[PDB]
Amino acid sequence: CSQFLRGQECVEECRVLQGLPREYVNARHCLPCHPECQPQDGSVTCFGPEADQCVACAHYKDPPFCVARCP
C-alpha cells in the first residue's frame, strides 16, 4: 500500500480536517483521536490517541486531559 493505512484498508487519505472520527497520522497509518477531542474545522483535531493530545475538548477539561465529566 503506497497510500495511507486504516487498519487493513488502503485509503487515499486520513480524516485530518474532515470525517469522523478524526484522525492523526503516524508512519503512514490513519489512527483515531481520543473520543473526547472536539472535532476541529479550521485545524487538525489531535496530535495523538490520548485525551491530553486534543486541540479542544468535547466536554470538560481537567488539565491536561479532556474528560466526559469532572470528578
Binding site: 486520513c14 485530518v16 492523526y24 497520522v25 503516524n26 508512519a27 479550521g42 485545524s43 487538525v44 496530535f47
Partner: protein
C-alpha cells in the same frame, strides 16, 4: 466568485481547474469558511502538482490555520515529504510555531516520519 472556485479546486485535486482559475486571476490566498487557504487545502489532500502551481503563483507559505499550523506544519503532520520539500524551496519559515509552540520539526517527530524529520532537523 473565483476564490471559492479555486478553493474547491485545490480541495478536490483538480490540477487543470487550478491552473485555469489562476490564469483568470483567482485570489491565490483566498480564504474558505474556516479561514483555510488553497495552499493549505492542497497540502492536506496530498496534491503535489497543485501545491507547486499555487506556489509559482505567489501563494502565502506562512498562512496559518486556526491553531497556527502553516502548510509546512500540516505536511509534517500528515507525512507528505515531497510537499514539505517544495514548501521549503519556496520560503517556508521552518521556525514558525503553532499556538502550542511546536514547529514543523516537532510535528514531524510526532508523525514519526524519519526523512521529513531529517530534512527539518538540519535546519
Amino acid at each position: 466568485d473565483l476564490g471559492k472556485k479555486l478553493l474547491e479546486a485545490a480541495r478536490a485535486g483538480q490540477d487543470d481547474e487550478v491552473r485555469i482559475l489562476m490564469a483568470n486571476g483567482a485570489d491565490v490566498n483566498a480564504k474558505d469558511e474556516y479561514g483555510l487557504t488553497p495552499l493549505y487545502l492542497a497540502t492536506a489532500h496530498g496534491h503535489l502538482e497543485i501545491v507547486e502551481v499555487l506556489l509559482k503563483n505567489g501563494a502565502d507559505v506562512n498562512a496559518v490555520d486556526a491553531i497556527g499550523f502553516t502548510p509546512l506544519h500540516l505536511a509534517a503532520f500528515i507525512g507528505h515529504l515531497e510537499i514539505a520539500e517544495v514548501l521549503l524551496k519556496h520560503g517556508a519559515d521552518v521556525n514558525a510555531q503553532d499556538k502550542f509552540g511546536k514547529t514543523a520539526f516537532d510535528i514531524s517527530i510526532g508523525n514519526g516520519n524519519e526523512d521529513l524529520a531529517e530534512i527539518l532537523q538540519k535546519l
